[PDB]
């Protein structure tokens, strides 16, 4: 039973230790004087936030205008060549490429924009392996499409760095220049690609009715459970659905009861509802359709207000529901596509009738295999209103982000339909002009937009970002490839085969603005203002998740936004802290001075300067080191010695200042008693570790803007203690020790600049030795921001260093959150890969529970009562630093091993989507839309 004055005097002894050891060993107060002394070699220039945003909006506008324009050239030529064709029937005269293996076998160049072998002299062709022998529908369309060869080749010379041009086509071919070898079974139908089903129709309020009566059971039900799952893959993220069965009565076997958004997530609820359909009852078709036309009302919701589709997966029946379409379809504004599946011997008579009265189109499905071809030809009917406005339907329609099939990265496509002009201005009988040919696509990699958005003048905390009218993400730096979505991934191994590659999931990567950052009632008000807003900034105190999900910091974010002045399929946001409005412009003028700076950077001097490491960056002719930063550093010296424009000027100025911490403050100390290894990480990407012997175990990412502790120490105005991983793979441990950090504030003529982070990596053993000799002059735990053990007595805990305290003594920690200090948050990360459960690596949703300090008052006294043992806590925060000191009495007396508070990530389901739809997230759909011309002429279907 200790006493509070004696404890607080003893905490203030450990406070004055770790602070004074930090100020002496790190050259923090010495390095400011280095930055103060050289008042020259600067002109500190502002960022201005705004002026950055309007300039970077004009380049993202011109990039989508430069490539977009090319689309018009491919659409104008493709149609021109299509008029003069004359339909050859025999083919004894053609020579294309067939990229899956007369034909061509050309030369290949290893090229680096494509990261792959390209040709530049031919287009390649992908004919899906369901189709082909020479069948003169395919073979004739290789004829006129060969003309687009000159115009594909034209646009590389007009503007380089174009990625894949592509003409998709309604018969399934793809010509794409540059020609390249296509990447056991290759499924890949181009007509079901999100970039085709997007610019091939207008958005869609679908409603799927599924006959679940007693007559569908058997084969013809199993084809409906497959075909709805193959139907819903043809929906973009502007399209809405619902799935409704009918039988005796009617019901929306989905758990939604109205129309939903057809996200990645909301389509998964439907694929578990459809796969648990039972089959029993009596068909009636009158309680069914009258439930279908009510759902396509409900204006209450927030539908898209466009092509209304009722799709029908019945088997058969003798019921023309004539009393219903006269009730609801007098104005003929609901297209009804009807499918009739399986090999039932029923009456297909009425089902053909329902679709040819209601501008529909009857389809038929014999078996599995016809499912992929039939449920995509339903978009040729929806293109019928678009072709009748061919002067003004050629807008450009950009697709929201998805992974390329050729292995390029995240790419965004621009699409434009190509329509059949073969009589026009002469007009003509005009027989089948009411169908499109295909869609021209032009890719942009998001790296090419990131080339436009420089992330190296703003503090590593600052970053650009961009939101598309459905409230999803182009440039938030928390995206990364790998698909996202859905929940706990159950795979049984008791069902698979020694066979097929388990297909590649054409799903797009749609991250929500509320699920990249932390959800807050201000950032909602930002997004709903940013999604259509004209201009606005807001400065506020938020929770900022740290880059590795250990920690939560609290800082001031001043961010602003503006729309793209051209297209409206994006709007940008430059994000800046309050201490990053001013940056350092390098300005070096003597040419001897920067020559001496280059001397320092050579690897010959690591005994004198130490282990210097130089972050991978951009210039003319270099690469990305695969951990061989030594190879990058030698290549970088070859850049200087050939030189004997601002990144090259900054790093040379940065090395010259981090030199004078070594040769003037660390060379005069020479292996201090304590510490373990001094380190300096700056922006400019020069991280130096002084001794170089155990500094080879510096296991951190040398790119400083991706670096996990550099960003944290800029926010806090004091010492930050990081706690290392436990086991981690390897020796970061006792062998490594724990770290200290403090950013470096600079006082130029009334301004605030924080360029550098200076740190110490504390020896674990020597700081044990003070900690126990101070106690002779009881169960003590040093515990940081986040519940991680830094050190402790009792020596069963020192085998744990860095493990979260909830897996040590949870009864303290479940208590300690319940009395404030420390609170938490729980966010979701949609892209974390984990292992599949029970019934190798794939994507899943993980929870992330991150603990952090709440109030002030660094004195928390209180008593814990579990039962029949009680014990007394004295929780004391150390001042001017990031630490809690806890005095807990006697593990010893009887335990309470109830459970564990567990950090790290746990595989979980998402939020409840049945409740998430109720009050959904504000959004705005496009404005065009095309439906119901007077002409049309519906006399096909059949
Ligand atoms: C915990 O262990 C540390 C060793 O890793 C000890 O740190 C050293 O303590 C010395 C005295 O406490 C300091 O000496 C002082 O150094 C300054 C500048 O170097 C001189 O101006 C002072 O004259 C000198 N003191 C005297 C009496 O001459 C060491 O600088 C210091 N090491 C560092 C890196 O700061 C801690 O003392 C030890 N904790 C306790 C409570 O003993
Ligand atoms: C599609 O393929 C056909 C052939 O499979 C191409 O037709 C060919 O077109 C060229 C020029 O239009 C013809 O050349 C002509 O030759 C005659 C003599 O034979 C000459 O008098 C003309 O001055 C002209 O040079 C060629 O004969 C013709 N081939 C056939 C079999 O008729 C057509 O060009 C292809 N389409 C595209 C867009 O490339
Ligand atoms: C663009 O639309 C036009 C319609 O104006 C399409 O032209 C027609 O295409 C069909 C293809 O089935 C041709 O039918 C074929 O005619 C030959 C006679 O030479 C016959 O032997 C075949 O059995 C078949 O019936 C039709 O002739 C043709 N119309 C004309 C005036 O030539 C054209 O196909 C569309 N473009 C594309 C790429 O689909
Ligand atoms: C959405 O639809 C519901 C129907 O479920 C509407 O609720 C009806 O509102 C009228 C108002 O004229 C009342 O007379 C009815 O009694 C309501 N129905 C029920 C079952 O109570 C609702 O008004 C619609 N609009 C909104 C915004 O919710
Ligand atoms: C596109 O951006 C331009 C400027 O880049 C905007 O022009 C502004 O026009 C308003 C009034 O219409 C003026 O008050 C501003 O001074 C103009 N801005 C500039 C830069 O001078 C234009 O408004 C933008 N387009 C739209 C549709 O808002
Ligand atoms: C990264 O690249 C450098 C090349 O400069 C490697 O350094 C050489 O490594 C080999 C094998 O370990 C040694 O035999 C040489 O003596 C090293 N120096 C030179 C100048 O060749 C370094 O080992 C590479 N790192 C990794 C992890 O592969
Ligand atoms: C994330 O943590 C913040 C910590 O501030 C939570 O915000 C506080 O929540 C409590 C209880 O909900 C309120 O009493 C406080 O007034 C809130 N403070 C502020 C500034 O809003 C927030 O609720 C947490 N969010 C989640 C999803 O856990
Ligand atoms: C726009 O296109 C022209 C045409 O080649 C090109 O020179 C220019 O660099 C493009 N703009 C940008 C920002 O790349
Ligand atoms: C139907 O299947 C779904 C998905 O597995 C499940 O949630 C639901 O409980 C099932 N219903 C019945 C009656 O088995
Ligand atoms: C935001 O700025 C104010 C004024 O400069 C400062 O006092 C405050 O500490 C900052 N907020 C945080 C969370 O640090
Ligand atoms: C990780 O550390 C825990 C200590 O709780 C230990 O039980 C486990 O075996 C370690 N794993 C590896 C791979 O070393
Ligand atoms: C923990 O917090 C909850 C929520 O405020 C409260 O109901 C409960 O009483 C607290 N626990 C104790 C032991 O007071
Ligand atoms: C923060 O929590 C502690 C818990 O004891 C309390 O003493 C302190 O007053 C709280 N601060 C505020 C501002 O409520
Ligand atoms: C605590 O006391 C109860 C009776 O009040 C007794 O039955 C129980 O065994 C005791 N448990 C411990 C752990 O002391
Ligand atoms: Ca039936």
From Swiss-Prot:
Q: What else is known?
A: Binds gabapentin, an antiepileptic drug.
Q: Which InterPro entries match?
A: Ca_channel_alpha-2/delta, VDCC_a2/dsu, VWA_N, VWF_A, vWFA_dom_sf
Q: What does this protein do?
A: The alpha-2/delta subunit of voltage-dependent calcium channels regulates calcium current density and activation/inactivation kinetics of the calcium channel. Plays an important role in excitation-contraction coupling.
Phosphoserine PTM positions: 93
Instruction: Provide the primary localization.
Output: membrane
Give the membrane topology: Single-pass type I membrane protein
Name listed for the protein in its UniProt record: Voltage-dependent calcium channel subunit alpha-2/delta-1
Write down the species: Oryctolagus cuniculus
Q: Where in the cell is it found?
A: Membrane; Cell membrane
GO CC terms in record: L-type voltage-gated calcium channel complex; T-tubule
So which stretches are on the Extracellular side?
A: 1-942
* Modified how: Proteolytically processed into subunits alpha-2-1 and delta-1 that are disulfide-linked.
Q: Which family does it belong to?
A: Belongs to the calcium channel subunit alpha-2/delta family.
Q: Write out the residue ranges of the motif MIDAS-like motif.
A: 211-215
Q: Where is the VWFA domain?
A: 205-382
Task: Give the UniProt keywords, A-Z.
Answer: Calcium, Calcium channel, Calcium transport, Cell membrane, Disulfide bond, Glycoprotein, Ion channel, Ion transport, Membrane, Metal-binding, Phosphoprotein, Signal, Transmembrane, Transmembrane helix, Transport, Voltage-gated channel
Q: Which cysteines are joined by disulfide bonds?
A: 356-929
Tissue spec: Skeletal muscle.
